[PDB]
């Protein structure tokens, strides 16, 4: 419901979003995993902190245009995903890749809607 806040929650998503993209791309030109407990945990632990927050803003969140509640709950699990598997080189390109557009696309969205 705190929109200059909300706005900040949303870009600061989209740039840890583009973040993973940059990781997945290493992973893949690399052809080695990150570490789990050096790399994947804190990482990880740092988008599930962001996520919290926004969650705290789930009922204005869930009424802009575009949004509904299980959209809302689908974006934060695909995000949790990404965050994850964008530091395996076994991940499939094609389903990241896919799945990645999707959150960018909902994360628009909300960022038109919280302003
Ligand atoms: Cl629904
Ligand atoms: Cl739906
Ligand atoms: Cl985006």
Excluded: W
């Amino acid at each position: 419901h705190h929109h200059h806040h909300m706005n900040d929650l949303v870009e600061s998503l989209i740039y840890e979003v583009n973040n993973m993209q940059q990781n997945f791309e290493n992973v893949k030109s690399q052809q080695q995993d990150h570490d789990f407990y050096q790399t994947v945990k804190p990482y990880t632990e740092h988008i599930d902190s962001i996520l919290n927050e926004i969650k705290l803003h789930r009922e204005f969140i869930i009424e802009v245009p575009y949004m509904n509640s299980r959209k809302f709950e689908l974006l934060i699990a695909n995000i949790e995903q990404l965050s994850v598997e964008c530091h395996f080189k076994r991940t499939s390109r094609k389903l990241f890749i896919e799945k990645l557009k999707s959150v960018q696309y909902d994360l628009q969205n909300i960022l038109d809607g919280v302003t």
